[PDB]
């Protein structure tokens, strides 16, 4: 209506939880051990990559 | 003669003539068990 307004007569204090990711697990790969295991022969072929 | 092989996870029935060495545990070694060969450290195990 062009001539009426609603005013809050009261209030509520609210506490709200916002959860945010900030980091992830730091990961490391031994690329030689993953590809070749311990085999010397494969490690020599891997050098060619 | 046609020799047909199978190389299963089952007891070795025919083997090549390789001489066999003592176990060397707790060291990184080359190994060859029934032709299954690799490199690593051998230890006792609990495995069933
Ligand atoms: C807003 O509403 C709350 C209730 O929802 C009012 O608090 C009540 O106030 C009466 C009278 O003061 C008490 O008898 C009640 O016990 C109160 N309840 C609670 C939960 O506090 C509050 O007064 C209102 N705020 C304003 C500014 O009027």
Swiss-Prot record, chain A:
List S-S links within the chain: 36-42
Residues with attached carbohydrate = 2, 10
Query: This protein's superkingdom?
Result: Viruses
Role, per record: Precursor of the fusion protein processed in the biosynthesis of the S protein and the formation of virus particle. Mediates fusion of the virion and cellular membranes by functioning as a class I viral fusion protein. Contains two viral fusion peptides that are unmasked after cleavage. The S2/S2' cleavage occurs during virus entry at the cell membrane by host TMPRSS2 or during endocytosis by host CSTL.
Name of the protein: Spike protein S2
């Amino acid at each position: 209506s062009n001539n009426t307004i609603a005013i809050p007569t009261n209030f509520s204090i609210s506490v709200t939880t916002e959860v945010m990711p900030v980091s992830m697990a730091k990961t490391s790969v031994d690329c030689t051990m993953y590809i070749c295991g311990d085999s010397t022969e494969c490690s020599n072929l891997l050098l060619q990559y | 003669v046609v020799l047909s092989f199978e190389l299963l996870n089952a007891p070795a029935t025919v083997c090549g003539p390789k001489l066999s060495t003592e176990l060397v545990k707790n060291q990184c070694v080359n190994f060859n068990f029934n032709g299954l060969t690799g490199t690593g450290v051998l230890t006792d195990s609990s495995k069933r």
